[PDB]
Every structure is written in structure tokens, then in C-alpha cells.
Structure 1
Amino acid sequence: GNCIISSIYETYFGHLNERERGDMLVILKRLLGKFAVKYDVNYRFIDYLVTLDEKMKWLECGLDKNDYFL
């Protein structure tokens, strides 16, 4: 389920603002509940793809602390 969410997040949600991304996550979780595929309420793509060393390397390079830019 998290891999499905991660694929959709990577290839679909890269060009949406915060409110539309929230609505899209709401609709996608509604679809997952309708078709009964297990996913986490508290899943984070950062914890599954971004490492601490990579996060520090990007933070020192000038990246902001927002989840959006992360």
C-alpha cells in the first residue's frame, strides 16, 4: 500500500500546492478504503526514502525546513 502511495506521490503530486495535495490525499485514501487495500494513516515518504545523512546534506546546501521542499 505504501509503495502505491509513494508511486502516486512521486509521479502525480510533484506540482500541486498544499490544499490540492490534501484534497488529493483525501480522495486517494477514500479510493483505497473503497477497494480495501491496506495503507498507513501515519505513513511518511520522507521516512521511507530520505535518510538522515541525505537530509543533513540537503539542509546544509540551503534547502528549507518545510515538508514541501523536502
Structure 2
Amino acid sequence: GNCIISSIYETYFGHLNERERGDMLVILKRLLGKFAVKYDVNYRFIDYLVTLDEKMKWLECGLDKNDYFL
């Protein structure tokens, strides 16, 4: 479930505003429930790909604290 959410996150959600982004997340989660694959609700792609070392090394380079730019 996390890898299919990871794929849709890393591909689809570059040019989407946050309200419609959350709407599309919950829509695909609903479809996952309809087709019965085990995916959670509180998954974050940062929790699976971005390490704290790289996060610090990129925040020191001129990055803000907003999750959208992260």
C-alpha cells in the first residue's frame, strides 16, 4: 500500500493545490479500500524516503519549514 501511495505521491502531486491534493489522496485511498489493498491513513513519504541527515543538509542550503516545499 505504501509503495502505490509513494508512486502516486512522487508522480501525480507536483502541480496540485493542497485542498485538491488531499481530496485526491482520500479518493485514491477510498478506491484502495474498494479494491481491498492494505494501506494505512497516516503514511508520509518523508517517513519512508527522506532521512534526517539529508533533511538537515537541505534545510541548511536555503529551504523553509513548509511541508509543501519539502
Q: Unpaired runs of 5+ in structure 1?
A: none
Q: How much does 1:42 deviate?
A: 1.4
CA distance in 2, matches of 1:14, 1:30: 21
State how many pairs are aligned. Answer: 70
Q: How much does 1:34 deviate?
A: 0.4
TM-score with structure 1 length normalisation?
A: 0.95
Q: How much does 1:46 deviate?
A: 0.3
- Counterpart of 2:60? 60
User: Which 4+ runs in 1 deviate beyond 2 A?
Assistant: none
Q: Unpaired runs of 5+ in structure 2?
A: none
Percent same amino acid among aligned pairs? 100
Deviations 1:12-46 (A, max 9, x none): 11111111101101110110010000011111100
The root-mean-square deviation of aligned C-alpha atoms, in Å, is 0.7
CA distance in 2, matches of 1:60, 1:33: 40
TM-score with structure 2 length normalisation?
A: 0.95
